[PDB]
Amino acid sequence: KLHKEPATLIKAIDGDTIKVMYKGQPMTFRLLLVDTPETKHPKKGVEKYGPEASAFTKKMVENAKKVEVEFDKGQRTDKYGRGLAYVYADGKMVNEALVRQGLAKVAYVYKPNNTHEQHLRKSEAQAKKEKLNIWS
């Protein structure tokens, strides 16, 4: 069973990446299962809806009373030292909010870090149907 652990927001970095204090140490977290358009894309730089996805993640985490992180069943860090987690702001999953708003696509998925995959897929299908943002 996954469980939520508290974290304290330091800085929102991009639509898909936030820096937090976790267990008394600053740590970067990459949001599991979502791909946002980036403003800090390695080759490309600033993509369309990049600034909007970024502002959405920022406002959601900055205005929250409680930020929590939830690790999945598999690897907890990627090759860059980033935590891989579902992030919650006052009980609402940020990863899902992004997908629901048409500001992220569901990523290519890596077993066993796929626990909320079907939940996210359902939100993406609704955003497609409503033709939001990325899907407009």
User: Could you count the other beta carbons within 10 Å of the beta carbon of residue 129?
Assistant: 9
Residue 84: name the closest of 94, 74, 92, 93 by CA: 74
Task: Examine the residue annotation and report whether 82 is marked as an active-site residue of this protein.
Answer: yes
CB 103 within 8 A of CB 135: no
Q: Is 14 annotated as a binding residue?
A: no
Residue linked to tokens 């502002």:
55
With 0-12 CB in 10 A as exposed, 13-18 as middle and 19+ as buried, what is 2? exposed
Please name every residue paired with 67 in a beta bridge, in sequence order, or none if there are none: 7, 89
Domain residue ranges in the chain: 1-136
> Is 1-136 a domain of CATH 1.20.1630.10?
no
Task: Examine the residue annotation and report whether 100 is marked as an active-site residue of this protein.
Answer: no
Dihedral of alpha carbons 42, 99, 56, 13, sign: negative
Task: Examine the residue annotation and report whether 38 is marked as an active-site residue of this protein.
Answer: yes
Please tell me which residue in 52, 68, 82, 96 is annotated as part of the active site: 82
Resolution for the entry shown, Å: 1.6
Residue linked to tokens 């066993």:
112
Q: Is 72 annotated as a binding residue?
A: no
Q: Is 36 annotated as a binding residue?
A: yes
